[PDB]
Amino acid sequence: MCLKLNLLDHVFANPFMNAAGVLCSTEEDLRCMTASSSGALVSKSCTSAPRDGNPEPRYMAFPLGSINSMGLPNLGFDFYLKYASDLHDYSKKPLFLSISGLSVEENVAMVRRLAPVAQEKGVLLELNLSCPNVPGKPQVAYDFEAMRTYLQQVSLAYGLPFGVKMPPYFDIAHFDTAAAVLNEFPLVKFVTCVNSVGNGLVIDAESESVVIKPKQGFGGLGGKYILPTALANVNAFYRRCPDKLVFGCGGVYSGEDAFLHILAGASMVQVGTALQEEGPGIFTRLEDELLEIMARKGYRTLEEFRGRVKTIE
Amino acid sequence: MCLKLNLLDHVFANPFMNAAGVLCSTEEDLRCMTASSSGALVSKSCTSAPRDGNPEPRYMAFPLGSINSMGLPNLGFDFYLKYASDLHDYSKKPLFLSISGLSVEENVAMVRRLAPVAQEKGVLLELNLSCPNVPGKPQVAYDFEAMRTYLQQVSLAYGLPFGVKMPPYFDIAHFDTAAAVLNEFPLVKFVTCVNSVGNGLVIDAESESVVIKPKQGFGGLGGKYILPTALANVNAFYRRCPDKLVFGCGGVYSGEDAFLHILAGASMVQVGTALQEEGPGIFTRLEDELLEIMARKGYRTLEEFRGRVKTIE
Ligand SMILES: Cc1cc2nc3c(=O)[nH]c(=O)nc-3n(C[C@H](O)[C@H](O)[C@H](O)COP(=O)(O)O)c2cc1C
Ligand SMILES: Cc1cc2nc3c(=O)[nH]c(=O)nc-3n(C[C@H](O)[C@H](O)[C@H](O)COP(=O)(O)O)c2cc1C
Ligand SMILES: O=C(O)c1[nH]c(=O)[nH]c(=O)c1CCc1ccccc1CO
Ligand SMILES: O=C(O)c1[nH]c(=O)[nH]c(=O)c1CCc1ccccc1CO
Numbered sequence A, B: 001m002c003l004k005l006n007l008l009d010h011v012f013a014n015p016f017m018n019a020a021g022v023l024c025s026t027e028e029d030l031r032c033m034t035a036s037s038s039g040a041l042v043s044k045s046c047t048s049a050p051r052d053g054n055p056e057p058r059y060m061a062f063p064l065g066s067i068n069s070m071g072l073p074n075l076g077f078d079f080y081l082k083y084a085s086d087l088h089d090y091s092k093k094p095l096f097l098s099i100s101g102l103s104v105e106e107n108v109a110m111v112r113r114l115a116p117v118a119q120e121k122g123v124l125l126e127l128n129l130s131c132p133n134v135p136g137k138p139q140v141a142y143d144f145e146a147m148r149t150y151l152q153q154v155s156l157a158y159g160l161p162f163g164v165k166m167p168p169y170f171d172i173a174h175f176d177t178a179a180a181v182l183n184e185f186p187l188v189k190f191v192t193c194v195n196s197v198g199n200g201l202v203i204d205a206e207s208e209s210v211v212i213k214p215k216q217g218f219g220g221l222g223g224k225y226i227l228p229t230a231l232a233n234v235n236a237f238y239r240r241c242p243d244k245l246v247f248g249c250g251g252v253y254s255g256e257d258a259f260l261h262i263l264a265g266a267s268m269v270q271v272g273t274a275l276q277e278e279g280p281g282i283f284t285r286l287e288d289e290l291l292e293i294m295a296r297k298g299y300r301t302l303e304e305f306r307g308r309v310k311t312i313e
Helices: A027-035 A077-087 A104-121 A144-158 A172-182 A224-240 A255-264 A273-278 A282-297 B027-035 B077-087 B104-121 B144-158 B172-183 B223-240 B255-264 B273-278 B282-297
Strands: A005-007 A010-012 A016-018 A041-046 A059-062 A065-068 A095-099 A124-128 A162-166 A188-193 A197-201 A218-222 A245-249 A269-271 B005-007 B010-012 B016-018 B059-062 B065-068 B095-099 B124-128 B162-166 B188-193 B197-201 B218-222 B245-249 B269-271
Touching: A016 A041, A016 A282, A027 A041, A027 A077, A041 A077, A059 A273, A065 A224, A065 A273, A077 A095, A077 A104, A095 A104, A104 A124, A104 A144, A124 A144, A144 A162, A144 A172, A162 A245, A172 A224, A188 A224, A197 A224, A197 B223, A218 A224, A218 B223, A224 A245, A224 A255, A224 B197, A224 B218, A224 B223, A245 A255, A255 A269, A255 A282, A269 A282, A273 A282, B016 B282, B027 B077, B059 B273, B065 B223, B065 B273, B077 B095, B077 B104, B095 B104, B104 B124, B104 B144, B124 B144, B144 B162, B144 B172, B162 B245, B172 B223, B188 B223, B197 B223, B218 B223, B223 B245, B223 B255, B245 B255, B255 B269, B255 B282, B269 B273, B269 B282, B273 B282
Parallel strands: A016 A269, A041 A095, A095 A124, A124 A162, A162 A188, A188 A245, A245 A269, B016 B269, B095 B124, B124 B162, B162 B188, B188 B245, B245 B269
Antiparallel strands: A005 A010, A059 A065, A065 A218, A197 A218, B005 B010, B059 B065, B065 B218, B197 B218
């Protein structure tokens, strides 16, 4: 029985990795993730310049999941590029670099400089399309015209296979349109579904207060709240993008939750909130749990069940 | 110490009511809701003609909430109008009637018939804007120009105060646009936030299957999954529509969850999934739990804390 995967010209010991933003901002974090039993790691989505992010408190977690408005705190592109070029031990596992510039030109400039390092060292690009648009317009992946412009310009600039991180959608027409846009771009080889469920609001009943400071308490949701949203998006893009891989993200706390993501179509499975709460030990647990479900069901490999969710009559 | 309140020129014993669609399809259901301790009731969203809805199974519930693709099964507008005009006992509580026609013209046709009964009996209209749209477009409330058309035509045809049932939004630009559309219509006197979180997917690990038959298992989510989403939408529209009432719906299982909805801005609080699971007895429990929290806090009225959620500096 094995968890091994071979995709995007890389070998993965298992499908598990951090979700971008969790345990991946500093060299210390990346070294931690590298030392873990995860099959891969992704670095924090970066800008060309360092950012402090929003005022604290900006992340909180609860039994059913988390809320955050971090504001993209990050060490800047040069740091993550140096980590990829000079620091990361590729013998341990593959590395993804996530970018999230504030304009199309910022993203273009990053990927122009990432390309040679991608070609030499094999780092894999994940483009975060929840980057903000012009303020007062929706995030980039909720503006299909903007999304197309970004993808055309990044594809021209980078010239190598890459992937995209998508927010969740909630309407079949949006699944259709979003996937059609992505399918215009043959260099988009993987689609990670999903980013946080946007602009939720947690309120503490004792204090009668929101729990995070930015945005009057509004922030993205992760964790148990979002698993069925996540699965839907995984499966919707799995069905619509037959020439691409889908990576699952959202609501993974156990090997069972992973197994559902994989049934839905996921190749890699990313872990955000639960990793933030439990720490990197979670990867050995998730591996054991998923192998136990595979053994009970008689499955020897992930491909035996990936995308094999059954529908009713 | 009692929870009675006045809104829309009607008196309510308490802020609680069913969510449209739950326990409100048949005459039996409506008589059961009238006999309960709820402060009001809403009828199932209707079409001009009766509908069977989708094949079963089409609803399922779990510890964290529910999924449904009911397909608008209903007894037809004629039934619900007869109920409002001849059968409902207005001495017991107010009645809301929900409509969800498949085109603007169908909605206009229904509202022109309802208007005289609204004048005579005081039934209140809730217009469900999660209704289908023209080809290739998302639901009506996700197509802001369609929503504007619907509201312009219904306002002209009906001519009396009404409300609207909204899907959740996940982007601050969308909150801004939607509330701006609603604020163009002075006859829109309440906004109900939210409908189910669209097109989630629940998968059963043992069977490796989706749990509902329609739409390859995709359906709207309710219950614990959606409470922070619901609160966000309530508060966003509370802030943006100062001259309207907001009714909260989503994730209410307890008087503490009700309390959160009211702190976010809710006037009435609707109960869907938890009512479907626990039955009409839930209303006495909710009222007792809300009064208990109020007493612990020293609040004597709903108005003392409605919309008074605190932000962090
Ligand atoms: C503290 C925090 C920071 C995050 N920052 C990023 C980010 O930089 N880039 C990104 O693509 N997603 C970011 N996310 C979203 C996660 O990658 C993930 O999509 C989301 O948390 C859902 O997964 P979960 O249910 O496992 O938490 C962040 C999430 C959290 C909680
Ligand atoms: C079985 C079922 C049927 C529903 N049908 C309708 C409907 O006819 N009209 C409507 O406005 N909402 C409908 N909804 C949505 C609910 O009114 C409510 O917005 C949603 O379930 C969220 O509330 P909850 O978390 O309390 O379930 C339905 C929900 C369920 C579970
Ligand atoms: O850092 C964040 O707030 C964050 N949290 C998430 O749940 N997902 C994300 O993708 C982000 C980053 C979103 C982003 C990208 C580029 C600039 C600013 C921001 C913050 O809105
Ligand atoms: O009956 C439904 O599936 C249902 N479920 C919800 O959770 N919310 C709703 O609003 C609906 C009705 C949606 C609707 C309106 C008009 C015609 C068709 C349909 C069903 O897709």
